[PDB]
Amino acid sequence: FYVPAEPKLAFVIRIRGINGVSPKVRKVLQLLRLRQIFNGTFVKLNKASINMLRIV
Amino acid sequence: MKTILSNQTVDIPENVDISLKGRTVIVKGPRGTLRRDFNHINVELSLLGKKKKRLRVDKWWGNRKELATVRTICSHVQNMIKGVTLGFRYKMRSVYAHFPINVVIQENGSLVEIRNFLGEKYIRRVRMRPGVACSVSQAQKDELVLEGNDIELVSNSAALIQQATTVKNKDIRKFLDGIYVSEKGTVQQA
Amino acid sequence: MKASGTLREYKVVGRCLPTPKCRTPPLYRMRIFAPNHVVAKSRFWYFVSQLKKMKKSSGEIVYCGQVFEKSPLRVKNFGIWLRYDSRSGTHNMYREYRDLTTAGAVTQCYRDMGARHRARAHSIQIMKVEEIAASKCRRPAVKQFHDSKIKFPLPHRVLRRQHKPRFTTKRPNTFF
Amino acid sequence: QVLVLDGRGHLLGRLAAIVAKQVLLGRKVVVVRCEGINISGNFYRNKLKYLAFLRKRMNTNPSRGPYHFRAPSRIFWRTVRGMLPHKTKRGQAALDRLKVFDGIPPPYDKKKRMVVPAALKVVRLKPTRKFAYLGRLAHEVGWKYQAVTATLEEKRKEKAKIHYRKKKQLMRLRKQAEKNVEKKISKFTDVLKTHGLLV
Amino acid sequence: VFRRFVEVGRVAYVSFGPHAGKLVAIVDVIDQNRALVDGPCTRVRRQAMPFKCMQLTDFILKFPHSARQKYVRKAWEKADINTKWAATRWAKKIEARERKAKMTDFDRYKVMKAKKMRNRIIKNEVKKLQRAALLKAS
RNA sequence: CCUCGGUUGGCCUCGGAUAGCCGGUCCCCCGCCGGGGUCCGGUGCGGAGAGCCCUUCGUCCCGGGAAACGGGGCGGCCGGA
RNA sequence: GCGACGUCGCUUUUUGAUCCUUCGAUGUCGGCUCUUCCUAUCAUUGUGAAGCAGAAUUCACCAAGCGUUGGAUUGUUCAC
RNA sequence: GCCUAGUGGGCCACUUUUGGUAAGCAGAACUGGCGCUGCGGGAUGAACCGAACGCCGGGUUAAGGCGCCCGAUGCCGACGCUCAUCAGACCCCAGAAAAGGUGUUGGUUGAUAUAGACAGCAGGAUGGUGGCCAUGGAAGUCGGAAUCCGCUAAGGAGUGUGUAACAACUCACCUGCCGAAUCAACUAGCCCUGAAAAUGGAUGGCGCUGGAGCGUCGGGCCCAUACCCGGCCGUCGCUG
RNA sequence: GACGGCUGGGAAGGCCCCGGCGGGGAAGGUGGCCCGGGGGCCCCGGGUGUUACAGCCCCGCCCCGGCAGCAGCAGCUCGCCGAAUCCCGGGGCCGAGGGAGC
Ligand SMILES: [Mg+2]
Ligand SMILES: [Mg+2]
Ligand SMILES: [Mg+2]
Ligand SMILES: [Mg+2]
Ligand SMILES: [Mg+2]
Ligand SMILES: [Mg+2]
Ligand SMILES: [Mg+2]
Ligand SMILES: [Mg+2]
Ligand SMILES: [Mg+2]
Ligand SMILES: [Mg+2]
Ligand SMILES: [Mg+2]
Ligand SMILES: [Mg+2]
Ligand SMILES: [Mg+2]
Ligand SMILES: [Mg+2]
Ligand SMILES: [Mg+2]
Ligand SMILES: [Mg+2]
């Protein structure tokens, strides 16, 4: 089996609104520059970034 | 489960001319003709064999409540066949304890006049279903004979007599008087 | 899993991450019936986490591929051994189906369980699906099609296209 | 301009939904033979549904309370009205576009009646499910003109058979006329056969 | 009395779906509402096809219930269903519907004039037969 | 002359069944031409609403087809709650 | 016909619990009068079951159509 | 860094949680809401779901839906289940349980089956034995202790009606027709019983049963002030 | 409308037992043979059995057999795609700005 390399680029789209967001999730989203619904950013993937996406 | 096919065939005698217009069955014998309709069931009625020897009933793609209506049609057509060949004779007996039940038959055997059922002055008038002959049997003291070709009219008329001679406001296990269906046979034996 | 559309069967092979203790971990193969490979890999981690002490973080997936049917033109009988949770209790079942594809058989099983038992796809675990010959079937709704000269009509042909005129003169024929 | 619908064999709500949409889209609708409308479910169930309708009245003044019409025409009319927005001017005009009848009255007995296969009993019900008759339900709840409607309907049907036998005589005369003139219409029949209007 | 039965070898006419307007041979039945069909001469691949979209025809091939596409084509081209289907009134009133669909405006004008004549030539002789009935009924 | 407006060719009609229908037919059997058994066709309804009817730019010459029993229009009889 | 030891409910014709509405005011007990509604039916209609022989009485079903009184004592509801 | 208004009655929800039989009850934690806030959806609605708002045009969506009210399935949508003489119909949420059903559908376990079953229709039910013990007598035929044999296809020292005790009759058991499945115990879906309140009545209504119901799913479509594009206004920033 | 990539370097399938020569097998059992009855030799039943007067499944290469073709001309047997991707056409809404110079 050839296992491909784990991907290093992710495109993240915020799909919920700005209403009723818990403050940890809201903080990670503004650190991800996703402050509107349907805003998109490219995120490079490592353990620190994947654990933030895991929060949100 | 939808069973793909339930069929049952009925053998038809030489004495009987049978016909079908869709899901009505027209049975012809020595004693007359019987029509019964079956459009409430949605089956296939096939009339197979030349000289019309077997009547076959099919139910395609039926659940249990639709499969149960195949043998019902076959038993109804069989009862019509024995109605036109041998007839139906329901022999009722009039059980009394102290007051003899006096039965008078009127209008060719189409009305029953029941008197002195438990010493009542009320006279019960039971009109027969059309085509059912009603008769007091000879060589037997308290008996009455119903004769016809439709079993569902002969037995309904017997039920009408039976539920007309009913005891009220007493214990019916002690007050056993009434006119009850005792024998179920044919008019003409074989 | 939400059993969306036609399921697809996936060979998903996974293993642990090679620690200095276990230099090469054993490899585990599972057939997952899933809408797509992302859901297939998630159900693989569900089942492997239930069977072994292996997680997605401690493990990896070395292969995930759709396994095509070798005879999608041949009518086969399928035996599916089932584990599901009702509202009270968990039950083992065995069910039998008839299809051309084992993925079609499993999605037929999922909709059939949803119909007959009000059970959703998250509460249903496939354990084994095997193509069974016609002699070894136990279900009469499958066994009634085991006839070489099979013959049935289509009795009460309901009128589809109920709105092609929506206002016609002639009442329809349902006998054909 | 008028959509005349034979009410026989139709289901009440399905026909009333389609009629309500047509009178909202601005088409005058006449539904004839409303005693022939069928209602799904067993007759005792439907009878107790209309009996529960009858039990409702204004407790202080039933003459102001809900009017339980007994004719099948007016019952079907009430179902279409409940399917219409009848408390606005568009709703009232939609209702006024709709005529309902018992039997087939003399404006519409010399007229072809339309049928809606999406509302028919034979299409819309499984053959083993038991249905009810609007005329029988209506009569048993208080409609008085069931028997006289039946007598006028057999009076209409026996004249409709006369019209039908004459129409059949005309059409067999039409067929003998085609085989008579198939020499001088053969050069015009081929046009209608090549463009698919005949065979 | 049913005449059209789903059986191995019945030609069915596909009413809707992607293979509408075509003829298939019923090769096997799978369950209550689906059959493995195969049209090897009408360009339909062997596939599961539901019963509600096929319409049964009065043509029955003889092949086994698991025989492959070439034996199906052997039976089809031995029975010549491509011409016997065309000889029926069913395919003729399909192609008449197709021709009335393909009518152009000049076609509709020529149809209107030819029908305008044919109806009047029939209509005079209809009344001629009617009064030839009344003059000979007395 | 005001005013209310909508509309932009008609369908002049079996009863109905839906595990069945439709149309012809006599050598029949019953009735006051109507009904049924027989036979012949039709049935993804083509004696088809996936339909039918009408179909219009107008006038002038001459010819062919179709019509002549016709086209247009004043005196009588039937047809309807 | 009952039914212990246990257990599941219903109802708001009991008293509680709570304090949501009303303190720029919703007239606070009884009885008299009068109308209507409910059924968990005492009687009457139709019924089934009894350790229902008859009579009487129980238990149950459809059932609220029609009835369910005159008085002594007490302000009484209740009670007798 | 200064000055500083208003506030210092709160309430609701997931999860945790104390008192209380419980409560639209009283009291805490965490976070989010409502208050302070319109909008699409939940028929209706302080708090639920979606989403937060300048004035507009086009497009698209979310959550919800698409028989008619009422925009949208008028798809030739898929596979089943289900009949209710009290059907069912969508978070909050607006009404039900234990128990029960040869209603109907599935599944589990075990037998009893072509070394031919299960009904159903008939036939045999034997001698030892009419058993010691009790009881007047009980002889398989009130009771308790005995529960073996053989000719066997079979028959228990007998499952029941028998009689003062018997005689009789009946059952198991074993054979004839018969020709493909059958019996039992459970379990889970829908439906039904359980299930009774007062003005007339509420899946929102009409109504719906080849669903317009329930479960699992597919295409398509509908539109919010949400998102994109564009206009216009203002504000802020670029200490432009 | 056209092109291409990948996969199990697609899976199945198509043509030349109609792939050749062998070896078997069993059934949702084809011919035959036997039984049974229903017609005017035929059909439907029940039994037996292994190719015959149908078929199915398991040197299979006798160069992955040899050819087509290939995520397939319907405008459908099952995908993910596009630096391994482009062309063409139609419908709707809008025209903000106003000294850019050469
Ligand atoms: Mg939210
Ligand atoms: Mg008494
Ligand atoms: Mg006040
Ligand atoms: Mg006041
Ligand atoms: Mg007041
Ligand atoms: Mg009661
Ligand atoms: Mg609190
Ligand atoms: Mg408080
Ligand atoms: Mg405040
Ligand atoms: Mg705020
Ligand atoms: Mg808000
Ligand atoms: Mg609501
Ligand atoms: Mg949420
Ligand atoms: Mg907009
Ligand atoms: Mg809505
Ligand atoms: Mg903008």
Swiss-Prot record, chain A:
Write down the species. Answer: Oryctolagus cuniculus (Rabbit)
What highest taxon heads this organism's lineage? Eukaryota
Which residues of the complete protein appear here?
41 to 96 of 208
N6-acetyllysine carried by residues = K44
The molecule here is called Large ribosomal subunit protein uL30
Which function does this protein serve?
Answer: Component of the large ribosomal subunit. The ribosome is a large ribonucleoprotein complex responsible for the synthesis of proteins in the cell. Binds to G-rich structures in 28S rRNA and in mRNAs. Plays a regulatory role in the translation apparatus; inhibits cell-free translation of mRNAs.
Locations listed in the record: Cytoplasm
Q: How does it assemble?
A: Component of the large ribosomal subunit. Homodimer. Interacts with DHX33.
- Recite the lineage of the species: Eukaryota, Metazoa, Chordata, Craniata, Vertebrata
* Membership in a protein family: Belongs to the universal ribosomal protein uL30 family.
Residues bearing N6-succinyllysine are K47
Swiss-Prot record, chain B:
Where can this protein be found? Cytoplasm
Family affiliation: Belongs to the universal ribosomal protein uL6 family.
Q: Which GO molecular function terms does the record list?
A: rRNA binding; structural constituent of ribosome
Query: GO biological process: any one?
Result: cytoplasmic translation
Q: What is the scientific name of the source organism?
A: Oryctolagus cuniculus (Rabbit)
UniProt superkingdom: Eukaryota
What is the protein's known function?
Component of the large ribosomal subunit. The ribosome is a large ribonucleoprotein complex responsible for the synthesis of proteins in the cell.
Predominant cellular place of this UniProt entry's protein: cytoplasm
Q: Name one Pfam family in it.
A: Ribosomal_L6
Tell me if Lipid biosynthesis is a UniProt keyword of this record: no
Q: Name one GO cellular component term.
A: cytosolic large ribosomal subunit
Subunit note? Component of the large ribosomal subunit.
Keyword set, alphabetical order: Acetylation, Cytoplasm, Ribonucleoprotein, Ribosomal protein
Name of the protein:
Large ribosomal subunit protein uL6
Q: Which residues carry this modification: N6-acetyllysine?
A: K121
UniProtKB/Swiss-Prot annotation, chain E:
Q: Which cysteines are joined by disulfide bonds?
A: none
Q: Does the keyword Ribonucleoprotein apply?
A: yes
Q: Which GO terms describe its molecular function?
A: RNA binding; structural constituent of ribosome
UniProt-listed GO biological process terms? ribosomal large subunit biogenesis; translation
- Single GO cellular component annotation? cytosolic large ribosomal subunit
- Subcellular location, record wording: Cytoplasm
> Where are the Phosphoserine modifications?
S138
Keywords, alphabetical: Acetylation, Cytoplasm, Isopeptide bond, Phosphoprotein, Repeat, Ribonucleoprotein, Ribosomal protein, Ubl conjugation
Crosslink (Glycyl lysine isopeptide (Lys-Gly) (interchain with G-Cter in SUMO2)) position: K123
N6-acetyllysine sites (modified residues): K78, K84
Q: Which residues carry this modification: N6-succinyllysine?
A: K84
Q: How does it assemble?
A: Component of the large ribosomal subunit.
Q: Which family does it belong to?
A: Belongs to the eukaryotic ribosomal protein eL14 family.
Could you identify this protein by its name? Large ribosomal subunit protein eL14
Gene name of the encoded protein: RPL14
What fragment of the full-length protein is this? 2 to 139 of 218
